[PDB]
Design a protein around this ligand. Structure first.
Ligand SMILES: [Mg+2]
Ligand SMILES: [Mg+2]
Lengths: 203, 203
């Protein structure tokens, strides 16, 4: 259903545009860990409230963002392999890593980016405890992403994140439903933001 | 045709969001007037290249942005009156002017704005000389707009502008066609940007 559908969401494209770093992303804060017990915070014991999406992750790879199927958001593709996260897909060998000391690997036409950009979509299915849904606000957190990603929850568009190094937080409280909730994430190797960092390291 | 259609374009809404001032808007520059002749620039004689969209303008008024018809972009509404531009619609008396010295007239919940915001849509039909289309780049310019507007050319979405006081330039070269071209502009009284200016003057 539009505008949740990929074609509407993809264009106008955000990543090509210099101006919008992210859409629907909560302001950055030092991590608190959200633990109700006073002792735990002083103790520093791992918080019950905090949850990890880390684990085996469904993965799909496409040459271009246009290429990836619209249908996927509703369901994970049958073909796609499961890849551990956090991971670098190039490390997996789906795409060869590219290293350049000074030059951006992509041709330099800011803010425009190469028409075909390797895109990997990660779909995660997890179950949220009933207690969480009833009260409070639940926000997904990504420690790092590159270059830029589009976030879909339960087949519904959630957010756009423009910076790989920084953590991005989106609120899933509306999206979440009792029982398992599918998570769909789309990552593009090359972003409008990509121009900002030309630092030389394996990319 | 999506995403040109109003429902897709309207949401996600830009005006509610603090972050995006504008979409597809050319960078501000001191006016040049674009005149080929050397003498004219020294002379300061009004430029042939410069064109004025000023004149009688078709006008439509709706209580909310959702309210305004999708169909209009393709064609001007039969009912709507013709109003001189530049003009303030409240001056026309469609909507009573609201004045507040300190308080924003709208309830203060940044960045969110009142669900019904008076919206006026201006449609202008003009003919572009054939010579213009063949070579060069043609960009529409607005000296001022308030609070924020969505720009459609030839039934096709062009740009979003977030600042009323500043001039906003959009490039119409792709959109323009030989013969008359319809112009559709949508203006909203209350914008996310509205919060930025609380200066006290008749609004
Ligand atoms: Mg360097
Ligand atoms: Mg004041």
């Amino acid at each position: 259903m539009i505008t949740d559908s990929l074609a509407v969401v993809l264009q106008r494209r955000d990543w090509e545009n210099p101006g919008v770093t992210q859409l629907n992303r909560l302001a950055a804060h030092p991590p608190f860990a959200s633990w109700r017990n006073s002792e735990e915070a002083r103790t520093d014991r791992p918080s019950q409230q905090l949850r990890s999406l880390n684990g085996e992750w469904r993965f799909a790879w496409f040459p271009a963002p246009e290429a990836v199927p619209e249908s996927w958001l509703e369901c994970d593709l049958p073909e796609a392999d499961t890849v551990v996260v956090p991971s670098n897909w190039q490390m997996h060998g789906y795409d060869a890593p590219i290293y350049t000391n000074v030059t951006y690997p992509i041709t330099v036409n800011p803010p425009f980016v190469p028409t075909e950009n390797p895109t990997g979509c990660y779909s995660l299915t997890f179950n949220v405890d009933e207690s969480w849904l009833q009260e409070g606000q639940t926000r997904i957190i990504f420690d790092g992403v590159n270059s830029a990603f589009h976030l879909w929850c339960n087949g519904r568009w959630v957010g756009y994140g423009q910076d790989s190094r920084l953590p991005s937080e989106f609120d899933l409280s509306a999206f979440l439903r009792a029982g398992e909730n599918r998570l769909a994430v789309m990552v593009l190797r090359w972003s409008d933001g990509s121009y900002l960092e030309d630092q030389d390291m394996w990319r």
